[PDB]
């Protein structure tokens, strides 16, 4: 979607408030020591690199319009729409391992800091405002955002495997949402899922992301169909060639 500058003010302010509320008084890994990143963290970091490249390419071609829209698609459509939801199973679980907490919070704050730096040429005052409040926790120093270094993409942090995993998680989550809307099921009700025609990558992606899926898609259970199992009558969606079944039995 095209994103207006003024709408992005609101989006950035609210994102920053969420990040601050979820990092104040907590360890953001500002010490520079090891954290534990999941493929969700690696995905958003990889997307950030690609965005740095495209914004810079467009600025180099004097296309402020295209540079802003590439940035805004990252901030609005990836970071806000998805990453800020996908971190919730860690941020809101008191028993999340401390290294995962550190990795999640570091990632949240470093990506925000970089997004602010990239947006400064378009929206200097709001970005400066927020930056001054988060720079300490992001591990950045300097008096003003305008004279900070321009970000340079690190090809070593591009991670196509993580990206493919999170695109699968998105498609599964959207497929379940779409079934809820169609069957007028509350977004709150826990439901059972069956997966039909699941490849080995599907299985690996499920094993890796099961706890997140259960929490965020509000699932009672999720399992692959047993070899030679008949599948009960259900609403369906597709994630590639895999089909996602919600048995009607329940609702």
From Swiss-Prot:
Q: What does the UniProt entry say about where the protein is found?
A: Cytoplasm
Family classification: Belongs to the class-I aminoacyl-tRNA synthetase family. ValS type 1 subfamily.
Q: Give the quaternary structure.
A: Monomer.
Q: What is this protein called?
A: Valine--tRNA ligase
The record describes the protein's role as: Catalyzes the attachment of valine to tRNA(Val). As ValRS can inadvertently accommodate and process structurally similar amino acids such as threonine, to avoid such errors, it has a 'posttransfer' editing activity that hydrolyzes mischarged Thr-tRNA(Val) in a tRNA-dependent manner.
The written remark on domains in the entry is: ValRS has two distinct active sites: one for aminoacylation and one for editing. The misactivated threonine is translocated from the active site to the editing site. The C-terminal coiled-coil domain is crucial for aminoacylation activity.
Q: In the record, what lineage is assigned to the organism producing the protein? A: Bacteria, Pseudomonadati, Pseudomonadota, Gammaproteobacteria, Pseudomonadales
